[PDB]
Each structure stands twice: as structure tokens, then as C-alpha cells.
Design a protein around this ligand. Sequence first.
Ligand SMILES: COc1cc(C)c(Sc2cnc(NC(=O)c3ccc(CN[C@@H](C)C(C)(C)C)cc3)s2)cc1C(=O)N1CCN(C(C)=O)CC1
Length: 259
Amino acid sequence: VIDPSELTFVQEIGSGQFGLVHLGYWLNKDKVAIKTIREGAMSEEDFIEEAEVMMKLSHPKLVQLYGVCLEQAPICLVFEFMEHGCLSDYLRTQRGLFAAETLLGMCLDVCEGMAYLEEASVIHRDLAARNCLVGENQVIKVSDFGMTRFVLDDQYTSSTGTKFPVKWASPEVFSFSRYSSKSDVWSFGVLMWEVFSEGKIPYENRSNSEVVEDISTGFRLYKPRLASTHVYQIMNHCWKERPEDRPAFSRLLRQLAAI
Ligand SMILES: COc1cc(C)c(Sc2cnc(NC(=O)c3ccc(CN[C@@H](C)C(C)(C)C)cc3)s2)cc1C(=O)N1CCN(C(C)=O)CC1
């Protein structure tokens, strides 16, 4: 638990799934990012349960949750400040400046984070570039793993909802809500596409229904220029119809490191 007096709210930096994000300071010295959880956004008591375990999850390629500020309404989550924001934004902003090796390095970072979560029996559920953050020396860290379990907006959570992230969803997820580390693997493949495409939106921004149809019939994203023949076959292995035909993150890590 972080005491409210230990935090200083400096400036609003944006809004996400659960509401406001501020740049702040922790004990008047260290830069932190503070999520202010908006009313009706979170399943609050259910999260305060899972907060202890989430905090205990620690890895250099996961954005660290430093603590929870509970002694106030609305409650706040205190995070490691990532100096370059979301990967999705970062890729688009820096488009044209990336060497293939740097882009591969980003995929490696994410894969290391996911390998840790997979090992720890944790499903992300919404792995995408928008949910990864960029820190010192372009290091990429995975964030908000498992958080969609606490989202009250049924448009996001339900596979049939209008806000459902179909573009990163494996066939068994969008059809049957069947999550696993292997469904995160599908998402990771799409994230690889995003990285090597320098932040392009997968599936020409096609409708949710059209993507479901595309994937159901066998369509797959085409190779981005900066992705090698080898990288593209790794992507395609992530997009096998059956989750059992997809590699584990532990395997992908060996493959991406071997390059
Ligand atoms: C995936 O969602 C999130 C996950 C985490 C885990 C955190 S906790 C965080 C940890 N670290 C963060 N860093 C940043 O959000 C950031 C953004 C911009 C800049 C560059 N300009 C700075 C210096 C300002 C905005 C002060 C001018 C630097 C850092 S947020 C915040 C969000 C989130 O909701 N947003 C990310 C950042 N946003 C925007 C508009 O960029 C708002 C949505």
C-alpha cells in the first residue's frame, strides 16, 4: 500500500482503459506514472485481491506496478515511468528511423516478458503494441497483463462486444473466449507484425466481422518490408489455427534469440 501523501500529481499525460494517467512523483524524488481508476471502469474489490500477486510478478521486460493507493476514492495504481510512452505511438512517431535489428530487439523484449508470464501461469488477454511501453534506450516492457478481467465495459470484454480487440484475437478467442498462453502467442504474432510494420494497423482497419471472416477462412497478414523471410515464418507459426500448433513463448524466445 502506498500512502496518498507519498504521491504528488504533476500533470495529466493521457487517458486509457481505466481513466486518467498522470506524471507524478513518489516521495518527491522519483518519476512515476499514476493511473486514476474511474468510477464504473474497474471491478474494484476483485482487483484489490489480484493486486498482491500482480505486484509479486517482477521482470525487467514487464512494466512494474510499484504499489496501490487504496486510502482514497478513486484508487490509484503507481507504475514505473516509461519515458517514451506506448509502443504503438512510438513506432508511428519514429517511423522511418528503425533498422530491422532494432525492430527484432523490440519483439525479443516483449517475448521475454511473455515467456515470464507464461511460466508464471498468467494470460495477458490483450497483448498488442498499444499495451507495451517504451523506456530507457528503447527497451520495451509489457503492461496491463490480465487487466481485462477487471474491465466492466462489456463492449471490450465480450468477444461479441463492439470494442472487442478482434485484430489481435486468436480464432478460439473471438469465437469461444478460449484463452491460453497460446492465444497470447497469436496476439504476439500480430504484435510482431505491428513492430515490423512500424505501427501500421493490422487488417486495413477492416470491421470486427470482416476480420473474424478473414481469419476463419484462412487469411493472414502479409509480410512487412522490414521483416525477413525468417521472421515472417515465425509470425505465421504464431497464427496457426489450432493453439496446439502454435509454439510456446519459451520456444519463440529460443527462436528470436537465435537470429
Ligand atoms: C497501456 O496503457 C497504459 C499502461 C500503463 C502501464 C500506464 S502507466 C505509464 C507508465 N509510463 C508512462 N509513460 C507515458 O505515458 C509517457 C507518455 C508520453 C511521454 C512523452 N511526453 C511526456 C514527457 C509528456 C506527456 C509529459 C509531455 C512520456 C511518457 S504511462 C499507462 C497507460 C495508459 O493508459 N496510457 C499510456 C500513455 N498515454 C499517452 C497519451 O501517452 C495515455 C494512455
